[PDB]
């Protein structure tokens, strides 16, 4: 509806909904989320071969 | 009138969201915990240069098989490579040139491409005939097909032009559901390993995480300062790395529901044109509008290494699903298999 | 007297009995507006209760074909342009779309007389050559193969050894010889140009 | 529709004049009603007229016009002549709670629930009523008072006042807070 | 409508006067209703009384001829695709197969209109080159020869001497019946892909 600036109020309703779910969605502090990411990354560091030397036949790109 | 009142209401809602994030905002433990083992500088050498292209490479996408990359050149050419031997499994001319996006399906045999054609071209790699006969030509798009990613064998997301990031049923060639709400064009998409939540990065600098199982948005990450080039989910899908035409990368966490941590860079100022995660997701590889790209630590926010050896900008990145290497859809017409 | 569930319409000299539903392909169409009586209409054939409108039935042919059948197929001997003129007079954007698609199909079919024809270039190695010509995409015709010098790996068997050139009669444009541009596409084209 | 892209015509020619004259009509009608009516009569008549005005405005006004009109309605009828309706002669919260008429208490509350001003004024009113009841209870009544009616009689007073509150002014956090505060106040009087 | 041994159909406003018996060939087609003079199909016209069918007379021709004398004759001035659509409307499977065969013959003949077109590359040196150029198959057309760098001497009499790209205009089969893969075929395709 144009005379309401092309129903820009629908964006307001969507933002109401966005606040609703963002509040419903739990808020995880930055420090502990970072801790979880450290745990996953360091636990996966050895199997990330980018972090490790690769022999001339281990990769399928020197085969 | 009261339209301005509803706009105010939206403003105060965003203010509340900012307040909730700020309360959720804590000290980033990863950067202060910089006593983690140093990332150093990884001297990175490509074992296989993919000179099969002779035009610029705009998009590229490894497959679920994690051996075939579908690097698309804007001249209307798809090169389904053999990354392990530098052989062209397929070389497909495209009905229209200036293709900017190419994705490889969970089928492992379907490939998608989007140009200025406004028609999403899905090519069946394997048929009874043995040649790459096109599977489907999904029309109905309004703007240019800014980015495309395969949801399923018959479901796909096409962040098209005209603020469109709709879902499409490949078999019917029609939209499955309509995803809309952005005021800017949608040109960035990201695939979570969940494969059920896609964060679309539009030109209004709004990383809207949409849920594919509903016809409505899930989260709306912001903090961007320019249109979002590429978005890469973590190998857990718990957070995504975001790059826009700014001099800093960003990392938005869904559990925090806020920008978890930003990768400030003043040693390089070129816009972040592509973002990626390593096998662990510890290494965040950033493609840059200059020839040489980089890889920074997602933990200590420092450069793990430099992707050097290029002669023109890299327009897309793709890491091995085994983490053996990364292919760089550069503009020097060679994809460099950086092992 | 002149209107029923069906309606008699005098396109050209001939009179077709067609349902009021079938004649309308969008409520902006002039035909639908003519289906119900209007105070503006003065000249009509009240001899048989059929409204008089002045257009050729030959280009009404494909129009009514699409309206009744839901799919537009314009005969290879009849002007798709005449169908488009019929649609534009009757103000049916759907028919505008199909005539557009048919005209693209015809321009593919007439891609010998001047109208855009897609051409593409592919690289191939000596070994890959047989595969990618053999696995060359359906709907494309091979046009040329050129041998080149080998900058790597001796003089033959090079990843850049042969340039294949293929083509497609259908043009790459979204429609005909002119498509409505977009500004961001030009922005990115300038970005890639330099 | 003549607003075209903005609300300018709709906002200007009638929206605001309707709002302002609506405030004035509400003011004068509420004044006349308070002059002409007791507590319950004022409640019934003002609520009936509020429903009538809202009915007409929904017919004649848009959705976006609701936010101002509701505030004006709650401000000019149920916010200015309010303090009288709390307590008078022959009526009032303290007078009526002893009459045991639950239905009027409910309405006196549900009409007042739209404005937090009315709710807090009632909270003060029956807080004073409960404090008076507790102070009368802790002192001996008649020829002596049993410890059942004095120390643990506070518990009986709390239970009966909880019944009154739940049946008249429903379960609201502010009312529970004030009744618990009163219960703790004369708790020291045992 | 009016009772007669024949029946007059208003096919697109055009009167088809055809006998009722030739329309009893396919009850599984809409026509066999139109031939009922009893109230199974009742249709009239306020000018003649003809029954009304909202199907085109454009592609009604070949289908009606197939009904009359058992064989379709698609006029080579009308779209065989339109005849296939008309066959679909009356869903005569034999007629569907016949029009699809006509479209396949078209696509083989019009392989340069973007439809199926098969290509191959032979490898030969001059001695065998003359032989297999001379003994080229009927249907396969030579399209290009090319030399390949010879490590022996400078030119001829090396095994790697000449590639011979040849082509054939191949029929495109309308989809839904062709190009249907198989599981073990895909297993072997994956085996041979590497």
From Swiss-Prot, chain A:
Query: How is this protein positioned relative to the membrane?
Result: Lipid-anchor
Q: Which UniProt keywords apply?
A: Acetylation, Cell membrane, Host-virus interaction, Lipoprotein, Membrane, Methylation, Prenylation, Transducer
Location of the protein in the cell: Cell membrane
Expression across tissues is:
Expressed in fetal tissues, including testis, adrenal gland, brain, white blood cells and brain.
Q: Which residues carry this modification: N-acetylalanine?
A: 2
Q: Which SMART domains does this UniProt record tie to the protein? A: G_gamma, GGL
Annotated Gene Ontology cellular component terms? extracellular exosome; heterotrimeric G-protein complex; membrane; plasma membrane; synapse
Gene3D superfamilies found in the cross-reference section: Transducin (heterotrimeric G protein), gamma chain
UniProt keyword Disulfide bond, yes or no = no
Where does the record place a coiled coil? none
One Gene Ontology BP term is:
adenylate cyclase-activating dopamine receptor signaling pathway
Molecular function terms from GO: G-protein beta-subunit binding
CDD domains recorded: GGL
The record ties this protein, via InterPro entries, to: G-protein_gamma-like_dom, GGL_sf, Gprotein-gamma
Superkingdom, taxonomy of origin: Eukaryota
Q: Can you state the subunit structure given in the record?
A: G proteins are composed of 3 units, alpha, beta and gamma. In this context, interacts with GNB2. The heterodimer formed by GNB1 and GNG2 interacts with ARHGEF5. The heterodimer formed by GNB1 and GNG2 interacts with GRK2. Forms complexes with TAS2R14 and G-proteins; these complexes play a role in the perception of bitterness. Component of the TAS2R14-GNAI1 complex, consisting of TAS2R14, GNAI1, GNB1 and GNG2. Component of the TAS2R14-GNAT3 complex, consisting of TAS2R14, GNAT3, GNB1 and GNG2. Component of the TAS2R14-GNAS2 complex, consisting of TAS2R14, GNAS2, GNB1 and GNG2.
Which family is annotated? Belongs to the G protein gamma family.
Q: What is this protein called?
A: Guanine nucleotide-binding protein G(I)/G(S)/G(O) subunit gamma-2
UniProtKB/Swiss-Prot annotation, chain B:
- InterPro entries in the cross-refs: G-protein_beta_WD-40_rep, Gprotein_B, Guanine_nucleotide-bd_bsu, WD40/YVTN_repeat-like_dom_sf, WD40_repeat_CS, WD40_repeat_dom_sf, WD40_rpt
Which sequence positions carry the modification called N-acetylserine? Answer: 1
The impact of changing residue 336 to Q is: In MRD42; uncertain significance; no effect on protein abundance; no effect on complex formation with gamma subunit; no effect on trimer formation with alpha and gamma subunits; no effect on receptor-driven G protein activation
Task: List GO molecular-function terms, semicolon-separated.
Answer: GTPase activity; GTPase binding; protein-containing complex binding; signaling receptor complex adaptor activity
The listed outcome for residue 79 to N is: In MRD42; also found in patients with acute lymphoblastic T-cell leukemia; reduces interaction with GNAI2, GNAI3, GNA13 and GNA11; induces activation of PI3K-AKT-mTOR and MAPK pathways
SUPFAM superfamilies, alphabetized: WD40 repeat-like (SSF50978)
Q: What is the effect of changing residue 29 to F?
A: In MRD42; uncertain significance; no effect on protein abundance; no effect on complex formation with gamma subunit; no effect on trimer formation with alpha and gamma subunits; no effect on receptor-driven G protein activation
Q: Name one GO cellular component term.
A: plasma membrane
What this protein is called in its record is Guanine nucleotide-binding protein G(I)/G(S)/G(T) subunit beta-1
Organism, by scientific name, is: Homo sapiens
From Swiss-Prot, chains C, E:
The BTB domain covers 5-107
Domain notes from UniProt:
The BTB (POZ) domain is atypical and mediates the formation of a homopentamer instead of a homotetramer. Homopentamerization is due to the presence of 4 residues in the BTB (POZ) domain: Leu-17, Gly-61, Val-73 and Ala-79.
Q: What is this protein called?
A: BTB/POZ domain-containing protein KCTD5
Any one GO cellular component localisation term in the record? cytoplasm
Disordered: region residues: 174-194
Q: Where is the composition biased (Basic and acidic residues)?
A: 181-194
Give the multimer and partner information.
Homopentamer. Interacts (via C-terminus) with GRASP55/GORASP2. Interacts with CUL3 and with ubiquitinated proteins. Interacts with CRY1.
Give the classification, highest ranks: Eukaryota, Metazoa, Chordata, Craniata, Vertebrata
One of the GO BP terms on file:
proteasome-mediated ubiquitin-dependent protein catabolic process
According to its UniProt entry, the function of this protein is described as: Its interaction with CUL3 suggests that it may act as a substrate adapter in some E3 ligase complex. Does not affect the function of Kv channel Kv2.1/KCNB1, Kv1.2/KCNA2, Kv4.2/KCND2 and Kv3.4/KCNC4.
Give the molecular function GO annotations.
cullin family protein binding; identical protein binding; protein-containing complex binding
Subcellular location(s) of the protein: Cytoplasm, Cytosol; Cytoplasm; Nucleus
Native species of this protein? Homo sapiens
Induction note: Up-regulated in peripheral blood lymphocytes stimulated through the T-cell receptor.
Protein keywords:
Acetylation, Cytoplasm, Host-virus interaction, Nucleus, Phosphoprotein
Curated annotation (Swiss-Prot), chain D:
Disease per record: Pseudohypoaldosteronism 2E: An autosomal dominant disorder characterized by severe hypertension, hyperkalemia, hyperchloremia, hyperchloremic metabolic acidosis, and correction of physiologic abnormalities by thiazide diuretics. Neurodevelopmental disorder with or without autism or seizures: An autosomal dominant disorder manifesting in infancy and characterized by global developmental delay, variably impaired intellectual development, and speech delay. Some patients have seizures, others have autistic features or behavioral abnormalities. Additional variable features include cardiac defects, failure to thrive, or brain imaging anomalies.
Q: What does this protein do?
A: Core component of multiple cullin-RING-based BCR (BTB-CUL3-RBX1) E3 ubiquitin-protein ligase complexes which mediate the ubiquitination and subsequent proteasomal degradation of target proteins. BCR complexes and ARIH1 collaborate in tandem to mediate ubiquitination of target proteins. As a scaffold protein may contribute to catalysis through positioning of the substrate and the ubiquitin-conjugating enzyme.
Query: What subcellular compartments does it reside in?
Result: Nucleus; Golgi apparatus; Cell projection, Cilium, Flagellum; Cytoplasm, Cytoskeleton, Spindle
Identify the domain of life.
Answer: Eukaryota
| Protein name, entry field | Cullin-3
Q: In which tissues is it expressed?
A: Brain, spermatozoa, and testis (at protein level). Widely expressed.
């Amino acid at each position: 509806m144009a005379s309401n600036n092309t129903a820009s109020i629908a964006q307001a309703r969507k933002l109401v909904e966005q606040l609703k779910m963002e509040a419903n969605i739990d808020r995880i502090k930055v420090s502990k989320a970072a801790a979880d990411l450290m745990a996953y990354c360091e636990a996966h560091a050895k199997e990330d071969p980018l972090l490790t030397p690769v022999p001339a036949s281990e990769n399928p790109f020197r085969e | 009138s009261e339209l301005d009142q509803l706009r105010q209401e939206a403003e105060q809602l965003k203010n509340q969201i900012r307040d909730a994030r700020k309360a959720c905002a804590d000290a980033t433990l990863s950067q202060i915990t910089n006593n983690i083992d140093p990332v150093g500088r990884i001297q990175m050498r490509t074992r296989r240069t993919l000179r099969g292209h002779l035009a610029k490479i705009y998009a590229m996408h490894w497959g679920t098989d994690s051996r075939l990359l579908v690097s698309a050149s804007q001249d209307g050419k798809l090169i389904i490579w053999d990354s392990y031997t530098t052989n062209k499994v397929h070389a497909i001319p495209l009905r229209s040139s200036w293709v900017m996006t190419c994705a490889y399906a969970p089928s492992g045999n379907y490939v998608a491409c989007g140009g200025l054609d406004n028609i999403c071209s899905i090519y069946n790699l394997k048929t009874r005939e043995g040649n790459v006969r096109v599977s489907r030509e999904l029309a109905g798009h309004t703007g240019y097909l800014s980015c495309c990613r395969f949801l399923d064998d018959n479901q796909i997301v096409t962040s098209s032009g005209d603020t469109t990031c709709a879902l499409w049923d490949i078999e019917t060639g029609q939209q499955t559901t309509t995803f809309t709400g952005h005021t800017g064009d949608v040109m960035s998409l990201s695939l979570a390993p969940d494969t059920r939540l896609f964060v679309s990065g539009a030109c209004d600098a709004s990383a809207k995480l949409w849920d594919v199982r509903e016809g409505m948005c899930r989260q709306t990450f912001t903090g961007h300062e320019s249109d979002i080039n590429a978005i890469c989910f973590f190998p857990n899908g718990n957070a995504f790395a975001t790059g826009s035409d700014d001099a800093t990368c960003r990392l938005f966490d869904l559990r925090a529901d806020q920008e978890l941590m930003t990768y400030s860079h003043d040693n390089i100022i070129c816009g972040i044109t592509s973002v990626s995660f390593s096998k662990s997701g510890r290494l965040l590889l950033a493609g840059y509008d200059d020839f040489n790209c980089n890889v920074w630590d997602a933990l200590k926010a420092d450069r793990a290494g430099v992707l050097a050896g290029h002669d023109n900008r890299v327009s897309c990145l793709g890491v091995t699903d085994d983490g053996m290497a990364v292919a760089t859809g550069s503009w020097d017409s060679f994809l460099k298999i950086w092992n | 007297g002149s209107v029923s569930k069906w309606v008699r319409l005098n396109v050209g000299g001939t009179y077709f009995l067609t349902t009021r539903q079938t004649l309308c392909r969008d409520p902006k169409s002039f035909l639908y507006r003519l289906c119900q009586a209007d105070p503006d209409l003065d000249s009509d054939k009240d001899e048989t209760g059929a409204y008089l409108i002045d257009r050729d039935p030959t280009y009404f042919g494909p129009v009514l074909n699409y309206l009744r059948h839901g799919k537009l197929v314009i005969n290879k001997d009849l002007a798709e342009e005449g169908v488009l003129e019929e649609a534009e007079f009757y103000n049916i954007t759907s028919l505008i779309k199909l005539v557009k698609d048919k005209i693209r199909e015809r321009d593919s079919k007439t891609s010998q007389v001047p109208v855009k024809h897609v051409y593409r270039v592919l690289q191939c190695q000596e070994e890959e050559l047989t595969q990618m010509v053999s696995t060359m995409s359906d709907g494309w015709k091979f046009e040329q193969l050129v041998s080149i010098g080998s900058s790597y790996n001796y003089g033959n068997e090079d990843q850049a050894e042969f340039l294949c050139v293929v083509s497609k009669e259908l043009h790459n444009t979204p429609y005909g010889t002119a498509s409505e541009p977009s500004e961001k596409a030009k922005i990115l084209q300038e970005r890639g140009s330099r | 529709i003549l607003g075209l892209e903005g609300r300018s015509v709709y906002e200007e020619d009638f929206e605001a004049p309707f709002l302002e004259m609506s405030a004035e009509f509400f003011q004068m009608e509420s004044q006349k009603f308070l002059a002409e009516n007791s507590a319950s009569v004022y409640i019934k008549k003002v609520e009936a007229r509020i429903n009538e005005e809202i009915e007409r405005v929904m017919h004649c006004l848009d959705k976006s016009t609701e936010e101002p009109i509701v505030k004006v309605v709650e401000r000019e009828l149920i916010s200015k002549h309010m303090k009288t309706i709390v307590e008078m002669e022959n009526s009032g919260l303290v007078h009526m709670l002893k009459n045991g008429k639950t239905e009027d208490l409910g309405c006196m509350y549900k009409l007042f629930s739209r404005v937090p001003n009315g709710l807090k004024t009632m909270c003060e009113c029956m807080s004073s009523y409960l404090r008076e009841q507790g102070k009368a209870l802790v002192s001996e009544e008649g020829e002596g008072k049993n410890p059942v009616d004095y120390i643990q009689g506070l518990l009986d007073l709390k239970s009966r006042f909880d019944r009154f509150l739940l049946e008249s002014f429903n379960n609201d956090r502010l009312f529970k807070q004030t009744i618990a505060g009163d219960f703790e106040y004369f708790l020291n009087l045992n």
